Amino acid sequence: DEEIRVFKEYSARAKYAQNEGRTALEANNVPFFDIDVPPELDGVPFSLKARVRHKSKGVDGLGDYTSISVKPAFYITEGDETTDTLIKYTSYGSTGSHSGYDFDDNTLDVMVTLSAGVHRVFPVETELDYDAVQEVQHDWYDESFTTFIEVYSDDPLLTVKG
């Protein structure tokens, strides 16, 4: 069995966000999930992933051939869920028009090194595309063309075996 530890699934489009700290993102209703890092993973790098869908064609009335640059990230509290400082994690960028075919879904795949205890994770889109700004007046904290279908880990360090 190739085990998968699911952390969360999201149906809503992820919001554009710069690294403005935990309080700012929560104020703007950026959904999150918490990960409780156990003592045996205290300060130990592990793999965190997301199934990511980019879909731009006609979204908010955007042109079907408009090129949209994307770069999803996790923003994760360095301290616990009550602290503000966030660390940025990215792994890929993509560009051009996006149809959002499930067989084209991308994978954010990062190495995360965290202290023991709870950390809050914000799945976000970090790239605000200028064509989007001009065509459909997208700005920071608007819903982007990026959706975190599922956040997960297939790292044996995190999964329940079976």
Nearer to Ca ion, 65 or 101 (CB): 65
Which residue in 43, 46, 58, 92 sits closest to 72, CA to CA? 92
Residue 4 · residue 156 · CB < 8 Å: no
Per CB under 5 A, 67 contacts Ca ion? yes
Q: Which of residues 93-152 bind Ca ion (CB under 5 A)?
A: 129, 131
Nearer to Ca ion, 102 or 139 (CB): 139
* Structure tokens belonging to residue 16: 């554009």
Residue 118: CB minimum distance to Ca ion, A:
26
> Which of the stretches 30-38, 50-58, 63-71, 140-148 binds Ca ion when contact is defined by CB under 5 A?
63-71
Which helix or strand (DSSP H or E) is residue 133 part of? helix 130-136
Q: Using alpha carbons, list the distances in angstroms from residue 82 to 48, 77, 87, 121.
A: 21, 9, 14, 12
Residue 53: CB minimum distance to Ca ion, A:
18
Nearer to Ca ion, 4 or 27 (CB): 4
Residue 10 CA to residue 116 CA, distance in Å, equals 26
Residue 113: CB minimum distance to Ca ion, A:
23
Per CB under 5 A, 155 contacts Ca ion? no
Question: Which residues of this protein are in contact with Ca ion, per CB under 5 A?
Answer: 67, 129, 131
